[PDB]
RNA sequence: CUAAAACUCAAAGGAAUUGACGGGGGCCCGCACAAGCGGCGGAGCAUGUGGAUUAAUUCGAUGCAACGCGAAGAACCUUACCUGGGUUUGACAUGCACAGGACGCCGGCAGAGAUGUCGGUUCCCUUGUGGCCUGUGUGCAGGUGGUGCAUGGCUGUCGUCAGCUCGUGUCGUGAGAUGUUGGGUUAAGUCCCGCAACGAGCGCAACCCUUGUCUCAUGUUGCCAGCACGUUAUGGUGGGGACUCGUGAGAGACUGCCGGGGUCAACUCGGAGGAAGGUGGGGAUGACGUCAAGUCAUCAUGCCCCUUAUGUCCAGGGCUUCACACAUGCUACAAUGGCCGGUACAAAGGGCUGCGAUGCCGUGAGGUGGAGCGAAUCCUUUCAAAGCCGGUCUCAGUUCGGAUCGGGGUCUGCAACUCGACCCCGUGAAGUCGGAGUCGCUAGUAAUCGCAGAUCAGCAACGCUGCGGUGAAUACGUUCCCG
């Protein structure tokens, strides 16, 4: 182990918590239903890239804010998808739970979405080098994106020997606290196993 | 040892066994699995087939061995030497 | 660990709440005062008749998801392996690495 | 000490005698940080010596030091891939340190039933030139003399 | 001197490049050595491992970097091992079906228990059926079964060492080379000057935490200096920001200034100031990679294997066995001490079905009891021990040492036999400072003393992680040893 997770390194300075509620006696069950909601929303939706999931709790009422790059796929025109997610969220003992489906402004400056796309391409038949080149070149076009590093590990290309490869463009100072580093990790499922993809993206610094 | 307030711990199974055994003043071989049961002066004549781990060892109670537990007289590990 | 053993731990907990709440506690209250007539009461013998799983002495703090029986932390209900991984990801509010 | 000599600690003077040497002695006899007990031992030894001889502790202590102070020693030196016992001149600070250490160590092996009495007897014998520390100084000077041939390097 | 053959090999060779190595050289570092202090190796005990044993002594870990390790808590459970007793769409999930109103509970009996049986209780939808389970099934579950030489993830180590690379250019047929070498300097591939190189990236440093000084803000549960009431029992009480303290903001060290060395360059020596002077002290942070390092037993996982069992339930036992060996620690061998009496100073942390006081009962573990506290308030006593004062012991296998053993008890737990801790009485072993050899430590350090926490019903805790009390010696210098 060499590098700690960038989100946890700047959790108290730059980034913000993905769950927002206060609990003293009911911390454990709140955590239980939080992780249940997270796994339910991760398993239910896989076509549209789920960027993020926030949960807010005040007594009975829960607000689950889910971000995706394709809101139309995860929502129903008559509310069918909305009805499904609502019904499966009531069943998680969430009492009164309401969902805010939202859309990301730039779906290529998000490290999680970039890793999602890279894994999806690498899964079926795409050579990995093409995946990293396309992802990096597409990331540089965005205005605020100033650096990007993409690294994949595993049996790349179905080989018998595991390998690690990484390509960088710009500045990625993982040691700098004020600089924000969007970090995204995802595991692509190939017939020869599992390939890990990590993406770091630098868009300016906050003070 | 067990506290004096709680009283001696004797399992109910072999308890009712020994009350039904001594009511007619006949002492047949009683087979038991509860090594943890202590020895009561009501066991003075009875002989127990106390479990060991492989088989049951016969133990004939006397006045001297009261207050101990059955498991004392059923040695578990068998060591003869190197 | 093993699914059967993760389940059996929970079954002990529901047994404990059902029995140890009053049955396996009133007998202890009987045995506490030497003044209380325990010997003829057979509160010892009556409490032996209860299932062993009633006793909390048979419980085991396992990891709430992982099932890990050792290296447990009561504040989080999580294994040392899992606490390290979720604290690093900023999942436990108000937890961070130390320096002093 | 690869990058140069290290600074020295400037130990303070004593309250009841006002000399550096007695403070050095109490620091030498110090064990486990029990400075009060070491000071008690040293002060009692000095008072015992004063009562026995009738003169001031410090003068006879200095006489004992000068009696047991060495001037030549022997060190193992490797020249040309070969080791020899070379006699070496001793700096005054090292001589004082060695003399005090020898005094304390040899007084610890005496048979006078108490540290204070053993130390008093040892310092008196060293003042008169009869202590075992004097014998150790004689032996180390003899060993330095015996290896004088190796003094040229 | 001339000079074969059978047979056998798929090569033998020449030059040069990158590493690695040298009992080759040069320049440097590190408690590496040298100077010291305390130990281990000798004894008793605690713990782990090897071996042996056993029905089983579950499994993994083997120099640094395994061996008070996974295990931050093995009587049962844990548990994965053994004996025996049950069970199979299974201990637990979800889907396709047939029948239903019960599943579910609560008491009795038999059994070591699992379990079997007996007795009382019985669904709400709404006519289509849904929730429960029954059996019948059928997909399927379930494996701490194998392969860390198929893997992900996580971690150790070289090593917090200063190094590892790339773009373009240039040289060479090519592997490759330069940049990264040379002089100087630094803790540093840190920087300066040169230079077929010009730049860049990951490394170094800085940004973060704590700590040392001060300013502003700040007064409760925290202080009390000046004022009143206090009753001994004290900030205890009214009151007060003055001094601490608590926690917010800020200042403060930047070679900033001076003198001298220095290519007037990096950098270096000394001095003033300041609380702190030259990365102030300690942390968090561990580059490319190495060792097919460790982990299919945190978890996930490709492939193989079991599936009336290698799954699953229960009782008992085992992981605690002992002719030995190795390792890590604790207690000692005593007078720098043992015992008795008095007496003064900490920090940090924990507490709700928990901390638990006063009082009372025991000699003592402890029992009764419950004040007050989710806690700067109450409890852990007001907190300590080493320390200081007084008395006694008088160099002895002892008033040292406590092992071992006999008897009697307390607490937890359904249960202290195998196999808990503690308390009381008696018992009183080895041990006289420990061979070859070997380890830790440069200052609030070694040494020594006590306190707290996690795990935890109880503890094997002398272990681990923190906190403070008292607090040394030495470093001449890189020849030898290791990296």
Strand bridging mode A147-154 / A163-170: antiparallel
Give the C-alpha separation, D99 to D104, whole Å: 9
Q: Which residues contact B41 (CB under 8 A, 6 or more apart)?
A: B63, B66
Which domains can be identified in chain A, with CATH numbers?
16-105 (3.30.300.20), 106-207 (3.30.1140.32)
User: Facing residues of A64 across strands?
Assistant: A55, A99
A 10 A CB-CB count for B72 gives 12
Interface check for C36 against chain B (CB to CB < 8 A): the answer is no
Q: Which residues contact C25 (CB under 8 A, 6 or more apart)?
A: none
CATH number at residue B15: 3.30.860.10
- The answer to whether the CB of C65 falls within 8 A of the CB of A38 is no
- Alpha carbon D76 to chain centroid, angstroms: 22
Q: Which domain holds residue D120?
A: 20-147
Angle formed at CA C47 by CA C44 and CA C52, multiple of 5 degrees: 130
Residues of A in contact with C64 (CB under 8 A): 28, 32
R_g (Cα) of chain C, nearest Å: 20
Classify residue D153: in a domain, yes or no.
no
* Number of structural domains chain B divides into: 1
User: Facing residues of A201 across strands?
Assistant: A148, A182
Locate all alpha helices (DSSP H) within A45-199, ordered by sequence. Answer: 71-74, 80-90, 111-124, 128-141
Give the C-alpha separation, D28 to D59, whole Å: 19
At B25, list the tokens: 């003043």
Give the C-alpha separation, A193 to A182, whole Å: 27
A 10 A CB-CB count for A44 gives 14
Residues of C in contact with A32 (CB under 8 A): 64
Protein residue closest via CA to C1' of E286: A2
- The answer to whether the CB of A163 falls within 8 A of the CB of A153 is yes
Give the C-alpha separation, A21 to A40, whole Å: 20
- The answer to whether the CB of A172 falls within 8 A of the CB of A200 is yes
Distance D31 CA to E386 C1' (A): 13
SS3 C19: helix
A 10 A CB-CB count for A102 gives 13
Give the C-alpha separation, D95 to D93, whole Å: 5
Classify residue D25: in a domain, yes or no.
yes
CATH number at residue D56: 1.10.455.10
DSSP A125: T
Phi, psi of D99 (to 5 degrees): -65, -45
What separation in angstroms does the CA of C86 have from each of A150, C27, C97? Answer: 23, 43, 12
Angle formed at CA A154 by CA A126 and CA A111, multiple of 5 degrees: 70
SS3 C27: helix
- The answer to whether the CB of A195 falls within 8 A of the CB of A119 is yes
Give the C-alpha separation, D16 to D47, whole Å: 11
Classify residue D4: in a domain, yes or no.
no
Strand bridging mode C78-79 / C72-73: antiparallel
Q: Which domain holds residue B40?
A: 1-82
The secondary element (H helix, E strand) that includes residue D58 is helix D57-68
The secondary element (H helix, E strand) that includes residue D141 is helix D132-146
* Resolution of the coordinates, Å: 3.5
Burial-class residue A116 by CB neighbours within 10 Å (0-12, 13-18, 19+).
buried
Locate all alpha helices (DSSP H) within B1-43, ordered by sequence. Answer: 12-22
DSSP secondary structure, D38-56, as one string:
HHHHHHHHHHHHHHHH-S-
Burial-class residue D119 by CB neighbours within 10 Å (0-12, 13-18, 19+).
buried
A3, A31, A181: best mutation site toward chain C, by most C Cβ within 10 Å?
A31
Burial-class residue B39 by CB neighbours within 10 Å (0-12, 13-18, 19+).
buried
Q: What is the signed CA dihedral for A11, A16, A18, A20, rounded to 10 degrees? A: 110
What separation in angstroms does the CA of C100 have from each of A9, A34, C95? Answer: 17, 33, 15
Burial call D65-81: b when 16+ CB within 10 Å, e when fewer:
bebbbbebbbeeeeeee
Q: Across the beta sheet with B47-51, what order do the strands follow? A: B30-32, B47-51, B56-60
- The answer to whether the CB of B56 falls within 8 A of the CB of B31 is yes
Residues of B in contact with C39 (CB under 8 A): 7
- The answer to whether the CB of B37 falls within 8 A of the CB of B14 is yes
Classify residue D15: in a domain, yes or no.
no
- The answer to whether the CB of A196 falls within 8 A of the CB of A122 is no
Strand bridging mode B30-32 / B47-51: parallel
B34 to chain C, minimum CA–CA distance in Å? 13
R_g (Cα) of chain A, nearest Å: 19
Which of A174, A196, A199, A175 has the alpha carbon at shortest distance from A186?
A196
- The answer to whether the CB of A158 falls within 8 A of the CB of A191 is yes
SS3 A151: strand
* Number of structural domains chain D divides into: 1
**CB contact (8 A) between residue C38 and residue B11:** no
Classify residue D8: in a domain, yes or no.
no
First to last CA, chain D: 23
DSSP secondary structure, D69-94, as one string:
--SEEEEEEE-SS-EEEEEEEPPHHH
The single residue listed with the structure tokens 């003044």 is C35
Classify residue D40: in a domain, yes or no.
yes
Distance D36 CA to E384 C1' (A): 21
SS3 B10: coil
Classify residue D7: in a domain, yes or no.
no
Phi, psi of A205 (to 5 degrees): -130, 150
SS3 A21: coil
A 10 A CB-CB count for A129 gives 13
Touching pair A, C by Cβ (3+ pairs < 8 Å): yes
Protein-contacted positions of strand E (CB under 7 Å): 29-34, 37-38, 52-57, 70-74, 76-80, 82-83, 91-92, 106, 111-114, 141-144, 150-156, 201-210, 282-289, 298-299, 301-302, 311-318, 321-323, 335-337, 353, 367-369, 387-389, 394-395, 409-418, 420-421, 443, 446-448, 454-457, 467, 469-480
SS3 B55: coil
Percentages (nearest 5) of helix, strand, coil residues in chain B: 20, 20, 60
User: Facing residues of A53 across strands?
Assistant: A66
- The answer to whether the CB of D45 falls within 8 A of the CB of D52 is no
């Amino acid at each position: 182990g060499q590098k700690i997770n960038p989100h946890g390194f700047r959790l108290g300075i730059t980034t913000e918590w993905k769950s927002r509620w206060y609990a003293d006696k009911q911390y454990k069950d709140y955590v239980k239903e939080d992780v249940a909601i997270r796994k339910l929303l991760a398993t239910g939706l896989e076509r549209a890239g789920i960027a993020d999931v926030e949960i807010e709790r005040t007594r009975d009422r829960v607000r689950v804010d889910i971000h995706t790059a394709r809101p139309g796929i995860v929502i129903g025109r008559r509310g069918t998808e909305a009805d499904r997610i609502r019904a499966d969220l009531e069943k998680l003992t969430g009492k009164q739970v309401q969902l805010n489906i939202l859309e990301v402004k730039n779906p290529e400056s998000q490290a999680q979405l970039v890793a999602q796309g890279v894994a999806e391409q690498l899964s079926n038949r795409v050579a990995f080098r093409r995946a990293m080149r396309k992802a990096i070149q597409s990331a540089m076009r965005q205005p605020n994106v100033k650096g990007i590093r993409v690294q994949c590990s595993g049996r790349l290309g179905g080989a018998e020997m595991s390998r690690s490869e990484f390509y960088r463009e710009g500045r990625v100072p993982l040691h700098t606290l004020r600089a924000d580093i969007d970090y995204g990790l995802y595991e692509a499922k190939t017939t020869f196993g599992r390939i890990g993809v990590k993406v770091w993206i630098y868009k300016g610094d906050i003070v | 040892p067990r506290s004096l307030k709680k009283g001696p711990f004797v399992d109910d199974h072999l308890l009712k066994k020994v009350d039904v055994q001594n009511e007619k003043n006949t002492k047949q071989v009683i087979k038991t699995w509860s090594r943890r049961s202590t020895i009561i002066p009501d066991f003075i004549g009875h002989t127990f087939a106390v479990h060991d781990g492989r088989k049951h060892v016969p133990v004939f109670v006397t006045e001297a061995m009261v207050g101990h537990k059955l498991g004392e007289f059923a040695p578990t590990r068998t060591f003869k030497g190197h | 660990a093993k699914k059967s053993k993760i389940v059996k731990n929970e079954q002990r907990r529901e047994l404990v709440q059902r029995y140890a709440e009053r049955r396996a506690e009133l007998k202890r209250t009987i045995r506490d005062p030497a003044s209380s007539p325990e010997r003829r009461a057979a509160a010892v013998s009556a409490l032996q008749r209860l299932p062993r799983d009633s006793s909390p002495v048979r419980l085991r703090n396992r990891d709430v998801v992982d099932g890990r029986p050792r290296g447990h932390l009561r504040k989080f209900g999580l294994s040392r392996v899992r606490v390290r991984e979720m604290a690093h990801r900023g999942e436990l509010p108000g937890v961070r690495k130390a320096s002093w | 000490p690869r990058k140069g000599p290290a600074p020295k600690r400037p130990l303070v003077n004593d309250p009841v005698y006002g000399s550096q040497l007695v403070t050095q002695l109490v620091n030498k006899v110090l064990l486990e940080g029990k400075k009060s007990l070491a000071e008690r031992i040293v002060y009692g030894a000095l008072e015992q010596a004063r009562e026995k001889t009738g003169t001031d502790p410090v003068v006879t202590l200095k006489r004992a030091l000068d009696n047991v102070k060495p001037a030549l020693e022997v060190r193992s030196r490797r020249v040309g891939g070969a080791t020899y016992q070379v006699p070496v001149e001793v700096r005054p600070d090292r001589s004082t340190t060695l003399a005090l250490r020898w005094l304390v160590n040899f007084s610890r092996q005496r048979r006078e039933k108490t540290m204070v009495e053993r130390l008093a007897n040892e310092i008196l014998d060293a003042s008169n030139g009869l202590g075992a520390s004097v014998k150790r100084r004689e032996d180390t000077h003899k060993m330095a003399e015996a290896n004088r041939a190796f003094a040229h390097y």
